[PDB]
Amino acid sequence: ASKRALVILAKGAEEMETVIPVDVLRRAGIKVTVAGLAGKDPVQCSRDVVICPDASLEDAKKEGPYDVVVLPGGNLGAQNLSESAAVKEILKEQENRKGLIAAICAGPTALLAHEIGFGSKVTTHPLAKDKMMNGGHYTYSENRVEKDGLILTSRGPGTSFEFALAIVEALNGKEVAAQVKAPLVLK
């Protein structure tokens, strides 16, 4: 069967970090559900792009499991993900069932909030390092994309393509990732 991805979309999410992975994952033939943290209604992103989710997280979470759970960044978006008991449950289940978790920019700080993947190497946006590293529960990396087993992290809007292609490679392999990459006109 086709792989499935859950992208959790909260108010204040970085819209580039949401749309690039959704689009690239769909190019890879992955079934992506854009799930609204707050419910079914349109979501106002950090730079005021308004995105209509495919489903509420409440509904989407009952349609698991997913091959990857994707956490976009955006400072406020990531704070909303960090405060969510529903997100906690989803991430813990994903970690338990040995499933990929991918987070970008401020997104990885939600892993800290929910105590996910301690002892991994991770990266974040430079400005999110101190939050992520509070307590020394991870080892910090400056790689544009970092992958330590099932914890896949990345740095910012400008690393979103690399982040998304790394998810494609992890799920569908290097050849599919290369095939999806070529038409994008990446440098």
What are the residue numbers of the active site?
105, 125
49 Cβ contact partners less than 8 Å away, ≥ 6 residues apart: 15, 19
**78 is written with which tokens?**
């990531």
Q: How many residues bind Cl ion (CB under 5 A)?
A: 3
Q: In terms of CB distance, is 19 or 166 closer to a copy of itself?
A: 19
Site string for a copy of itself, 160-179 (x = CB under 8 A): -x------------------
Rg (CA), the chain: 15
Among 79, 80, 120, 159, binds a copy of itself (CB under 8 A): 159
Minimum gap (Å) between residue 19 Cβ and a copy of itself: 5
Residues in binding contact with a copy of itself, number by CB under 8 A: 33
Give the whole-angstrom CA distance, residue 123 versus residue 144: 8
| 3 lies in the binding site for a copy of itself (CB under 8 A) | no
Contact positions with Cl ion (CB under 5 A) in 43-62: 46
**Pairing mode, strands 55-56 and 121-122:** unpaired
CB atoms within 10 A of CB 105: 32
CA angle, 114 then 148 then 9, to 5°: 45
By the rule CB under 5 A, 75 interacts with Cl ion: yes
Q: Are 78 and 107 in contact (CB under 8 A)?
A: yes
Identity of the amino acid at 29: G
Query: Within positions 149 to 168, which residues make up the interface with Cl ion, using CB under 5 A?
Result: none
From 59-67, 92-100, 111-119, 149-157, give the range in contact with a copy of itself by CB under 8 A: 149-157
User: Which residues contact Cl ion (rule: CB under 5 A)?
Assistant: 46, 74-75
